[PDB]
Design a binder for this molecule. Structure first.
Ligand SMILES: *[C@@H]1O[C@H](CO[C@@H]2O[C@@H](C)[C@@H](O)[C@@H](O)[C@@H]2O)[C@@H](O[C@@H]2O[C@H](CO)[C@@H](O)[C@H](O)[C@H]2NC(C)=O)[C@H](O)[C@H]1NC(C)=O
Ligand SMILES: *[C@@H]1O[C@H](CO)[C@@H](O)[C@H](O)[C@H]1NC(C)=O
Ligand SMILES: [Br-]
Ligand SMILES: [Br-]
Ligand SMILES: [Cl-]
Ligand SMILES: [Cl-]
Ligand SMILES: [Cl-]
Ligand SMILES: [Cl-]
Ligand SMILES: [Cl-]
Ligand SMILES: [Cl-]
Ligand SMILES: [Cl-]
Ligand SMILES: [Cl-]
Ligand SMILES: [Cl-]
Ligand SMILES: [Cl-]
Ligand SMILES: [Cl-]
Ligand SMILES: [Cl-]
Ligand SMILES: [Cl-]
Ligand SMILES: [Cl-]
Lengths: 286, 285
């Protein structure tokens, strides 16, 4: 019927509730095509791992954040596979997006899909990547006051854990202090950053183009952590980037069909089944 | 728009020039959609990624294609699995028999839509084909029956090594038939023992088609031929044969790439699919 949801990469085993200044970076839009998908099997720390790197021009026109099963997915606490959501949205390239609660399925953190707020952070502060109507690519942390600005408002936005790069500099350490909570253990979260597994990320490059990353693997066995990931991205010319859901949620859909190897297993156990995720990251051409 | 052709797995570095029973499975008496299964399983203590496929009604769901459409081998053409599969609107497709990289010729007996497109030329290798009545053939055959008007072939291709016979491994028995005396004795045995990405084709007792794919790299990542054949046998394949592998190892699903090619691009950093000869296609009315 679906996945067994075994390969879990959880930043917080204890669900966070709804009860150092924090600012964000914005990159103006250079004036300007199809995406550029690149498959690879490269070595990190002596381990070969497979993944994908994507590039798109006109993020304001080719980028979109989708809800599980179409508009209103988060409002109904819905969960759908990247293929189902991508096939319905006719996305050239698609992969899983923000985090969620597996059992309930609601979308956690700020989320903007086509100028519509679908989820709110609720006082919590994590890494977020969004685009404003003027065409500026934003990354980092924003307050709900800035999120709600009606002058050059966000058109597409999602949130993830850790801010991977800021202005061409690694920003993991700066996120470890900001995005870590003290009520939960400090080593359950630090593992989420250091443990090896399949994960995804999103960012942009010096030329003003959107970037999407995906790496296959397994929790503790195969894949990469967040440290190894950022360096490869810097080698690829990304300015700002944030991490996204990974583990069994790591899914890369190309032309509406699965192109990655999910980490989770099927009920039959032998085979790997894609996970039903909340929001999806979509790239297309009108 | 082409591969760098770095990951080479050659059964014979020295090209052979132009100078025996088979098994057949009758059609059991009765059509579900194909079953594509992603996996990361352990072979000799190392995990490798791949796909395993199965289709019923091979007489109705199986097809052998030429690179870029009909006449591909006749024109010594080379095309990517995606290119050939997209034109045929195949749900599941992967590279097939071997070919000459320099010229582009298709090696071994090949039947695409009931027409012989290439001949073995006196050489004897493992072959998998289907006859119009529904009989599934595997092993070695003489040209008299191949072109015979008795249950003529509708789909046929050739590859190196016969992996399984009647639910039993036939590699040892195949090495004796498929061993050459002109080539060195260690290049071919390595071809069987070396670990890398390869593909295979076979069938089950119920009369269903099977297709296999395993990602990897020559000698670095993947599996050899010994580990590969058994995984299918544990899954209920009766007969199976090996197919082209290495940089040609490609799995295309619904017309799009779903595997990780071993070859590199001219840019070097990225991996590019290789342009192959014949392709195996699976679709539904
Ligand atoms: C490859 O593509 C097919 C999509 O094809 C269509 O889907 C349906 C409309 C059905 O009528 C098929 O015959 C069509 O050709 C995927 O198969 C299906 O997806 C749809 C979901 O919208 C579903 O209704 C079908 O039942 C699906 N078929 C199966 C076997 O599940 C197929 O999964 C695609 N493969 C991948 C990896 O995306
Ligand atoms: C798949 O990607 C290729 C890349 O060029 C594109 O040409 C093709 O249109 C895509 N598939 C569909 C159904 O659009
Ligand atoms: Br939470
Ligand atoms: Br040869
Ligand atoms: Cl600035
Ligand atoms: Cl590139
Ligand atoms: Cl290691
Ligand atoms: Cl609610
Ligand atoms: Cl979040
Ligand atoms: Cl495992
Ligand atoms: Cl569209
Ligand atoms: Cl091409
Ligand atoms: Cl090589
Ligand atoms: Cl196994
Ligand atoms: Cl296990
Ligand atoms: Cl071994
Ligand atoms: Cl692999
Ligand atoms: Cl003919």
């Amino acid at each position: 019927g679906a996945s067994r949801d075994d390969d879990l990469l959880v930043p917080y085993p204890r669900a966070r509730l709804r009860p150092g200044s924090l600012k964000h970076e914005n990159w103006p839009p250079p004036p300007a095509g199809p995406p550029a998908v690149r498959t690879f099997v490269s070595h990190f720390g002596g381990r070969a791992v497979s993944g994908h790197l994507t590039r798109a021009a006109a993020p304001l026109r080719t980028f979109s954040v989708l809800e599980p099963g179409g508009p209103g997915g988060c409002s109904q606490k819905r969960r759908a596979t990247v293929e189902e959501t991508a096939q319905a949205a006719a996305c050239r390239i698609a992969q899983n997006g923000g985090f969620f609660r597996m059992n309930t399925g609601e979308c956690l953190g700020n989320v903007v899909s086509d100028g519509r707020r679908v989820s709110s952070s609720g006082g919590l502060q994590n890494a977020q990547f969004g685009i404003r109507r003027d065409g500026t690519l934003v990354t980092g942390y924003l307050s709900e006051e800035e999120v709600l600005d009606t002058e050059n408002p966000f058109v597409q936005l999602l949130s993830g854990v850790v801010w991977l790069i800021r202005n061409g500099s690694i920003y993991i350490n700066e996120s470890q202090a900001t995005e870590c909570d003290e009520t939960q253990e400090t080593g359950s979260f630090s593992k989420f950053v250091n443990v090896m597994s399949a994960r995804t990320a999103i960012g942009h490059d010096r030329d003003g183009q959107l970037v999407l990353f995906h790496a296959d693997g397994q929790t503790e066995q195969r894949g990469i952590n967040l440290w190894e990931m950022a360096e490869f991205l810097l080698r690829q010319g990304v300015v700002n980037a944030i991490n996204l859901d990974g583990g069994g949620s790591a899914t890369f859909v190309l032309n509406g069909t699965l192109a990655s190897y999910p980490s989770d297993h099927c009920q039959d156990n032998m085979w790997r089944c894609p996970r039903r995720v909340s929001t999806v990251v979509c790239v297309h051409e009108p």
